[PDB]
Amino acid sequence: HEFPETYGISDIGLPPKLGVKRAVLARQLKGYLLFFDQILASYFEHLSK
Amino acid sequence: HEFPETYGISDIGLPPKLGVKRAVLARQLKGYLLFFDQILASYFEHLSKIKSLLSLDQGPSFTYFTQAIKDIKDVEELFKDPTLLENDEELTKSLIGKLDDTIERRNQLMDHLIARFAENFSSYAFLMKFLYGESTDEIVLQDKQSFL
Amino acid sequence: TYKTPGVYIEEITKFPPSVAQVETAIPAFIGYTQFARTKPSVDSDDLILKPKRISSLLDFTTYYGGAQNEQGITVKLTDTLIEGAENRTINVPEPTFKSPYLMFYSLQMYFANGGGPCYIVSTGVYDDWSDSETPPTINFSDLESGLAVIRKEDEPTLLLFPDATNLPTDDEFYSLYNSALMQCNDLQDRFTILDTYSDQTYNDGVEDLDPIPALRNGINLTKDYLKYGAAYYPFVQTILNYQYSADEIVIQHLSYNPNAIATALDNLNAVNGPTFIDAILDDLRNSVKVANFASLVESVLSTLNELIDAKEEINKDVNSAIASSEEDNAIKTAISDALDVFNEDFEGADKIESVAKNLSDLLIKIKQADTNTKVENVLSINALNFSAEFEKLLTYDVNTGLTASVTLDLFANIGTRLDDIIAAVSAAEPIDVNNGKLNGRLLSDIEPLDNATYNTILLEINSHKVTLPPSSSMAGAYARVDNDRGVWKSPANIGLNYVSKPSVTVSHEEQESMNVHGTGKSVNAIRSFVGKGTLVWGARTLAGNDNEWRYISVRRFFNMAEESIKKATEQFVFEPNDGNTWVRVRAMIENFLILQWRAGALAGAKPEHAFYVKVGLGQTMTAQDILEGNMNVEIGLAVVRPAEFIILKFSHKMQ
Amino acid sequence: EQESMNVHGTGKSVNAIRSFVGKGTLVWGARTLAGNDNEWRYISVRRFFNMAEESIKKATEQFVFEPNDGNTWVRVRAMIENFLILQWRAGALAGAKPEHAFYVKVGLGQTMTAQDILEGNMNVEIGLAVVRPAEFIILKFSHKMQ
Amino acid sequence: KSKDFLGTGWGFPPEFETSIGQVKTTSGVEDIQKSLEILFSTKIGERIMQPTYGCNLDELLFSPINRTLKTYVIELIKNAILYHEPRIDPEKIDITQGNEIEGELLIHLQYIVRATNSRKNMVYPFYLEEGTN
Amino acid sequence: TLNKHISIPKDMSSKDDLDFHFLREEGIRYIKELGSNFWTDYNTHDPGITMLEVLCYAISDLGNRINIPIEDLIANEEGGVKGQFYKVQEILPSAPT
Amino acid sequence: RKIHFFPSDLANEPLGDWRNFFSTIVSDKTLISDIENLDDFEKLRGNIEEFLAAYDQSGKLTPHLTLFVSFLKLLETSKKRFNQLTKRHLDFYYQEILHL
Amino acid sequence: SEGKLEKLRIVAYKDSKFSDEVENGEFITLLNPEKYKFQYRVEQNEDQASGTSSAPIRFNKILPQTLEFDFLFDRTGVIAGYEVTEDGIINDIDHFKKVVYDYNGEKHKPNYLMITWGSLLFKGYLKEMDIEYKLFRPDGTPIRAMATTKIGEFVEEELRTAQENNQPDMSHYRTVKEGDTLPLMTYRIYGDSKYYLEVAKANGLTNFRRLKTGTELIFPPLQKQ
Amino acid sequence: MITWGSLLFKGYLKEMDIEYKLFRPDGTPIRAMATTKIGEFVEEELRTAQENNQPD
Amino acid sequence: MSHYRTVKEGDTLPLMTYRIYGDSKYYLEVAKANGLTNFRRLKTGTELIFPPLQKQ
């Protein structure tokens, strides 16, 4: 949620006119970024315990 | 008398067009402020009595004093019983009353004045108890005044 | 009225409006108000179907009034023990039942967003709730009446209905708007601003409907009507507070140790005794003559007033016992019945309260009787009621030096009845396990008893904000644009005042279907942008695919230009129909249009490419028109249209 | 007490002399003994008229034995209008332009008939809009959040 | 509790309650509105050790209404606010006559409440480190 | 027990996990040491650098919660310390011998 | 208890007194149930002194008491000056009347 | 009273707050000036180094203002509304000089002036004056003169700081709207984005990366020593 | 920022003179003439980007 | 220098001291130089003196 709209990984999505390929690439980036979020989420979770 | 006209507690009153509620509130403020004036009036009153407190002829029966306040236009309505405002001695008994421990305070004043002549009446404290009971306190103060 | 020269400060004053001017953004608002009176201090309502011009909220408030107090506010408190210490939780939820009357709030938004003078038409005035869960409803035919009324006024240019979304069905909602679009086409000078029915999937009693698809099916008129309006979506969350009265809010209390009954019972034990009512009952049971009499009356009157106050205190505590006795409803009934009987000595059944009231009025009259006659000082007792009112306390006390012959009396039945109340209340002491001291009491009542809790509750109540349909803010925004740039400037990319956020977030995938659609029934979007806040995005009409009428600014420009020319030509109506008139009509129209061209409304490098006017026999008229008395004038106009899209391209060379 | 001096059922107003803090003794109020009247409640209005009427009366003495016809009626009008236009510029009379401040009418069929010509009468009608004082000031306050 | 530099104080026409032994107080915007009522209700020399507090609007009683007067009225109001009420900025002063006969002058003052704390605002937990002048 | 005036320090430098600029510089130093053969453009339009700055921001947030005082971090929903500590009334007194 | 109190909803009619405005000073209401008839103030004075200590520099008093107490504290400087009169009187007599 | 020709007035004052009038210190003209003129000056610092193409321009000061106008005195007898006087314009000029020029021994200076005509209202001091005498009676009594005048501007120092409401030194509050972030709001208030963790600690925020859209925040000033 | 057609200029006011010419009878002005002088402002970060200074 | 005034109704001692000296704080020295005890109420025929301030 910290990235710009241009990247296409936010709640409002990406405009249809930009085509499928760009939408697909946005999906690929979300996948990559989860490797960083799952780790951070663990540390926050550890405080709760 | 030190406040502005806007407050409504001065001699010229408050204009009718402002309504009853504002006039009522002015009455409430006058009530509150009397708690400050009655105390100040007492201190001024106390200066007027220095001559009596230290008199060689005859001292007063009270050691604390008060005054009626009459430069306020409705005091006849503010007080539950206006009678007291006609006599400062009754007002004193009602407002200060017992707080004034006259027997002990009167003796301290008399003893000081007697001491100024290098005299001493300590023995009356017990010698009079072989003659009188509780009534000695009045008798002894009368004798000390006569001595001076 | 002032009598003494001076400087006065007043909270409420009337202002002297006086000069009207021609403007293009003038809405009419049709809906319900608190009152509707020409004279600020009369009881009659006489402005309801009389359209009136308002310059600010300051005028609205003196003829129509404010908002209705909400009846749906709930306050709940809970007491619990932590390691032995008490801990109180305060809970004030959002109301689910809200008043349906929104005109006041809508006007506040209109003025906040830059609106000017406007017309108010009331369709009636506010009514009452039936219960805390039953709000009043809106009758469709009231809005239709108001529309028929505004039809006869010439000045208004925009049509709005502040309470349309509270109609019982969507079918009524759509019918109302189709009527407005048809009226705009009949008159040829107005534009309609439309809202959806709801921002949430709503149930029609049969099926669950999506709001944008539902509005599109609802408005089933053709292009000839659709070109006269536009719709906006979603609703907006504002910063306005709800109106309420603290006295009307009841507080629920739950606690680990139940002390509600115990409190009420201890207060009643104090009640049933000599320091509360026996002393009252024992005592209760010619200019000089008037003064003496008047004193004696006042003494009785004062005594009666104390007895009356006593009744009110009793009801306030007994009711908490009733409210708190959740279990064993048999006891709730026993308590309630005992109280209901007690009250009969004070209420209309045998009204002690009216005796006290009447003695007061009579007492004033006898004191003033001395103003002019000895007769008045007799009539006030034997023609009027002093004899008659004292009798209602004791029927014939005068029979003996000691009051006697009390064939009837209003006094002391209180003793037995208080005993009955206490006995019934005491039955609840082993019944009530969960209610605290304030349970069943009013918010205003607690203020003396507790203050930390009271202030906390008020802060929580005021955290709840008002939500409104967007149309009233748009009317405000239209006024700003017309003054800053002109009627030919598009309303889009303008920020809104007093808006925290749109009710819902609309994604790009969704937004494309709002702007371009097979039906042409476009919807303009309200959006939040980073660092900017809430903006209006898009400015198309309900005929959004049309080659001539898809933009709002184009349609509004034409309505304006046509009205101005029409007025300019009235001066020639009864002139001879010949060449000496035809030439004068042309010169005048051309002068109007050349000014609009210089102003930037019309397109074209020089007038020959911006506009034309044709008048003449053999051009626009024939011999038969001269005989009939007709005159035909043909006008064409090239207009300026907005940019909506920006396309960039980059290319390079090596140094 | 002061309110009953300024406004009263009889119209017989009394002006008050008052002491103000930091100023001393001032005259407070300026009404006539017909204080509820719509035209004559202010002192300055009544005194202005007495002055204006005397000045016009003197100005018209030069026409007393002139023929009673159009060549005189026109001269009387021009003179009266000149007096009044000066008073208007001076600030005594109300109105944005002379058409709203005053008028003078003289003529047969307007103010005179055939019988007046025979009797030797001449009728001149004059109207005047005058300036009145402010007595009360009313304030109001309202606010907005930044 | 963000808007704590506007402060809290006694209501102007102080009212005393009996349901609790307290005098009513005001805060925030309510307090500002009562401050304005006080300032324009008092004359310049009426306070004892504050010989320059209040206003001179009474100078204009029993005078005709014109452009010179209106200019003077506006000046008097603006200076009184600049000297004595640090929490606001005047927005507009509208001066009009609503009566052809009655001696009435109508003045409407509109103003804006400041979002930042003034160097002249004596509110207890702030002036100690922020009240420079 | 009076209220004090509240202000904020002006020396925003700690050289630890709460210091954004410090973290950003260390990030870039590590990148050069490990991957400068392939990744040399460190300008602000670069997606790589953009991701680094986002992560640095997230780290500061974590560090800030770790510093929340114990009284709150181990609090119970209902208050008290029943399962965490024994109180002096319970753990210090001794049977009488 | 000797002063009338006027409610804001009556046309200047009295209803009660000012009793409730000083009721927060005394922590045990027993001692003031008939205060106007006392001849022994030792218990009452004791509770008042506890009150004064408890709120000294607490920041917690209602504004009408805050003024009253601040006023009473300012008056302590008057007591200091006033009680020097006995010395001034003695000095005057020995030095200006008797010339010693 | 629209139709009234208003005449220009000048009043003398004793104090710098303009509330205590000099007795018999008011001048009213008999003929209005044709026009008047104002002057405004702002000064900047324009030092730059050699080799550069432009300078950094720094604000330095706002200089005092200036008003100028001309007067005509005439008692010949052709202007409607006025009378011919036995001594001509001798008492008109002597009263005009007593108000605007003469030294006052009570205050050890010349007078404070307020100049009012219509929309105009100006406070200050006389700087310059020239008077030229044109027509005379045979015995040497003047009946016409022309005067040129220059006035400076006065502001009292307590009023200057109230008009320059000078505000990182004071306290501030805002309400959160949708679309706001904490480092962007910190930049617009302080000039730097780096103070966002001190703003979050002063408000008790733990999840500052998502703000809720009704929250009112405080922004404390920076410490000075 | 001063914009008219092709013109676009950023800076500061240095000098101004205003002269009042016509008046209504009650002293309300209806005509005036103003002369103005504007200086030029460049921020220092933009000066080095415009002077793309390049043996180094 | 030295000064004298006569008391008119509406005068107070701290307001008159401010107009003569420039400061209201000298009112207790003016009352002592005139022998006034009840200075909070002035009688409206009294002539007062206002001495100058001492120099060294």
Yes or no: say if E62 and D30 are a contact pair by the CB < 8 Å rule.
yes
**Cα gap C33→C55, rounded to integer Å:** 17
The angle formed by the CA atoms of residues C493, C497 and C502, to the nearest 5 degrees, is 75
Q: State how far the Cα of C245 lies from the Cα of C235, in Å rounded to an integer.
A: 27
Taking CA B37 as the corner, what is the angle to CA G85 and CA G15, rounded to the nearest 5 degrees? 150
Distance CA C541, CA C545 (A): 9
Contact F9 H221 (CB under 8 A): no
Long-range CB contacts (within 8 A, 24+) of B52-58: B53/B109, B54/B109, B54/B113, B54/G89, B56/B113, B56/B148, B58/B145
Find, among A40, D109, D25, F1, the residue nearest to D16 by Cα: D25
CA of A43: which chain F residue's CA is closest? F62
State whether C8 and D139 contact (CB < 8 Å): yes
User: Rounded to whole angstroms, what are the CA distances from H197 to C90, C506, C586?
Assistant: 31, 32, 72
How many alpha carbons lie under 13 Å from residue B58 in its C-beta half-sphere?
A: 2
Which of D36, D6, C65, D9 is closest to B17 using CA atoms?
D6
- Closest by CA to C443, choosing from C462, C429, C424, is C462
Helix (H) or strand (E) holding C598: helix C579-598
Q: Judge whether A11 is closer than 8 Å to chain F, CB to CB.
A: no
Q: Chain D within 8 Å of H160 (Cβ-Cβ)?
A: no
Using DSSP, state whether E39 is helix, strand or coil.
helix
Q: Is F74 helix (H, G, I), strand (E, B) or coil?
A: coil
Secondary structure class of C635 (helix, strand, coil): strand
Answer whether B82 touches D (CB < 8 Å). no
Is I in contact with F (3 or more beta carbon pairs below 8 Å)? Answer: no
- H or E stretch at E33: helix E28-39
Cα–Cα nearest to C192, from C206, C202, C177: C177
d(CA C15, CA E80): 25
Q: Does C83 touch chain F (CB under 8 A)?
A: yes
How far apart are the C-alpha atoms of D33 and D51, rounded to whole Å?
19
For A12, which residue in chain C has the nearest alpha carbon? C507
Q: Which helix (H) or strand (E) holds C448?
A: helix C443-449
Please list the residues that pair with C6 across neighbouring strands: D136
Q: Is H221:H171 a contact under the CB 8 Å cutoff?
A: yes
Contact C116/C479 with Cβ under 8 angstroms? yes
**In 3-state terms, what secondary structure has residue B69?**
coil
Residue C537 near residue C512, CB atoms below 8 Å: no
Q: What's phi and psi for C611, nearest 5 deg?
A: -160, 165
Query: Any idea which residue has 């009226």 for tokens?
Result: C183
The torsion angles phi and psi of F89, rounded to 5 degrees, stand at -65, -20
- Residues of chain J in contact with residue E43, where contact means CB-CB under 8 angstroms, are none
What single-letter amino acid sits at C170? Answer: D
Residue F59 CB contacts under 8 Å (≥ 6 apart), including other chains: F17, F23
Residue of E39, E41, E44 to mutate, testing the B interface (most B Cβ within 10 Å of its Cβ):
E41
Q: Do residues H3 and D89 make contact, with C-beta atoms less than 8 angstroms apart? A: yes
**For F62, which of A2, A36, A44 is closest by C-beta distance?**
A44
Q: Which tokens hold the place of E95? A: 């001066």
Q: HEC states along chain D?
A: CCHHHHCCCCCCCCCEEEEECCCEEEEECCECCCCCCCCCCEHHHHHHHHHHHHHHHHHHHHHCCCCCCHHHHHHHHHHHHHHHHHHHHCCCECCCCHHHCEEEEECECCCECHHHHHHCCCCEEEEECECCCCCEEEEEEEEEEC
Strand order in the sheet with C533-537: C52-54, C118-125, C27-33, C158-160, C191-194, C229-233, C524-529, C533-537
> Is E125's CB within 8 Å of F3's CB?
yes
Report how far residue C323's alpha carbon sits from residue C434's, in angstroms, rounded to the nearest whole number: 11
HSE of E74 in the Cβ direction (CA atoms, 13 Å)? 18
As a whole number of Å, the CA-based R_g of chain F is: 24
As a whole number of angstroms, the distance between CA F66 and CA F70 comes to: 10
CB-based contact (8 Å) between J40 and chain B? Answer: yes
Chain H closest-CA separation from residue A1 CA (Å):
9
Of D140, D141, D144, the CB nearest to E112: D144
Which chain H residue's Cα is nearest to A2?
Answer: H209
Alpha carbon distance C466, C473 (integer Å): 14
- Token pair in block for residue F48: 């790589």
Rounded alpha-carbon distances, angstroms, from residue B124 to B104, B119, B141, C279: 15, 13, 10, 55
User: Is A45 at the interface with chain H, CB within 8 A?
Assistant: no
State whether residue E66 sits within 8 Å of chain I by CB.
yes
- Judged by 3 or more CB pairs under 8 A, whether G touches E is yes
CA C242 to chain centre: 10
How many angstroms separate the CA atoms of C631 and C577, rounded? 7
Q: Does E48 touch chain J (CB under 8 A)?
A: yes
Query: What CA–CA distance (Å, rounded) separates C415 from F80?
Result: 51
Residues of A in contact with C505 (CB under 8 A): 11-12
Sign of CA dihedral I4, I6, I12, I15: negative
Nearest chain D Cα to C13, which residue? D140
Query: Is A44 touching F (CB cutoff 8 A)?
Result: yes
Q: Which residues from G are below 8 Å from B35, CB to CB?
A: 68
**For D23, nearest residue in chain J (alpha carbons):** J10
DSSP state at residue B83: G
Report yes or no: E67 at the I interface, CB cutoff 8 Å: yes
Secondary structure percentages of chain E, helix, strand, coil, to 5? 30, 20, 50
Cβ-based neighbour number of residue C291 at 10 Å: 12
Answer yes or no: do H118 and I23 touch at CB < 8 A.
yes
**Distance from E42 to chain B by nearest Cα, in Å?**
7
Q: Which residues contact C479 (CB under 8 A, 6 or more apart)?
A: C23, C25, C114, C115, C116
Residue B10 Cα, gap to closest chain C Cα (Å): 18
Q: Give a three-class secondary structure readout of chain G.
A: CCECCCCCCCCCCCCCCCHHHCCCCCCCHHHHCCHHHCCCCHHHHHHHHHHHHHCCCCCCCCHHHHHHHHHHHHCHHHHHHHCCHHHHHHHHHHHHHCCC
Question: Residue G94 CB: number of other CB atoms within 10 A?
Answer: 11
Strands H112-117 and H9-13: antiparallel
Q: Which of C352, C315, C296, C20 is nearest to C156 (CA)?
A: C20
Q: Measured between alpha carbons, how far is C195 from H95 in angstroms, rounded to an integer?
A: 73
Q: How many CA atoms lie within 13 A of C93 on its CB side?
A: 10
Q: Report chain F residues whose CB lies below 8 A from the CB of A47.
A: 65-66, 73
DSSP bridge pairs for C192: C159, C229
Question: Which residues of chain J does D24 touch, with a Cβ-Cβ cutoff of 8 Å?
Answer: 8-10
> How far is C187 from C157, CA to CA, in rounded Å?
10
One-character DSSP codes across H58-115? EEEEEPPPEEEEEEEEE-SS-STT----TTTTHHHHHHHHHHHT--BTTTTB--EEEE
3-state secondary structure C455-516: HHHHHHHCCCEEEECCHHHHHHHHHHHHHHCCCCCCCCCCECCCEEEECCCCCHHHHHHHHC
CA distances from I50 to B67, I12, I42 (A): 89, 21, 10
E43 touching chain J per CB within 8 A: no
The pair of structure tokens assigned to C294 is 């008047």
Contact: C13, E106; criterion CB under 8 Å: yes
Query: And the tokens for C489?
Result: 């400037």
Which one of H179, H213, H214 has the shortest CB-CB distance to C530?
H179
For chain H, say whether F67 makes contact (Cβ under 8 Å): no
Whether residue B27 and residue G6 make contact (CB cut-off 8 A), yes or no, is: yes
> Cβ of D3 under 8 Å from any chain B Cβ?
yes
Structure tokens at C218: 């609802």
J13 neighbors D29 (Cβ within 8 angstroms): no
**Cβ contact C54:C118 at 8 Å:** yes
Task: Tell me which chain E residues have a C-beta less than 8 angstroms from the C-beta of D138.
Answer: 104-107
Dihedral angle sign, alpha carbons of residues J27, J32, J38, J41: negative
What is the total residue count of chain C?
655
Mutate to test the interface with E, among J8, J15, J28 (most CBs of E within 10 A): J15
CB-CB neighbors (< 8 A) of H213 in chain C = 500-501
Cross-chain Cβ contact H3/D95 below 8 Å:
yes
Q: Could you please report the per-residue DSSP string of C239-293?
A: EEEPP--GGGPBEEEEESS--HHHHHHHHHHHHSSIIIIIHHHHHH--HHHHHHH
Buried-state track E54-93, b at ≥16 Cβ within 10 A, e below 16: bbebbebbbeebbbbbbbbbbbebebbbbbbbbbbeeeeb
Strand intervals (E) in chain E: 8-10, 25-27, 88-96, 104-113
Question: Closest Cα of chain E to D62: distance in Å?
Answer: 36
What are the residues whose beta carbons fall under 8 Å from the beta carbon of H40, sequence distance 6 or more? H65, I15, I16, I17, I18
Residue G3: exposure state from Cβ atoms within 10 A (0-12, 13-18, ≥19) = middle
Determine the Cα–Cα distance for residues C36 and C43; give it in Å rounded to an integer.
Answer: 10
On chain F, the residues whose CB falls within 8 A of the CB of E129 are: 5, 7
Contacts of C540 (CB under 8 A, 6+ apart): C230, C515, C522, C524, C550, C551, C552
Which residues in chain D have Cβ-Cβ distances shorter than 8 Å to E110? 141-144
Chains J and F touch (3+ CB pairs under 8 A): no
How many beta-carbon pairs below 8 A join chains E and G?
A: 23
Q: Do chains E and D touch (3 or more CB pairs under 8 A)?
A: yes
| Token code pair at residue E65 | 């209404």
Decide if E88 contacts E72 (C-beta within 8 A): no
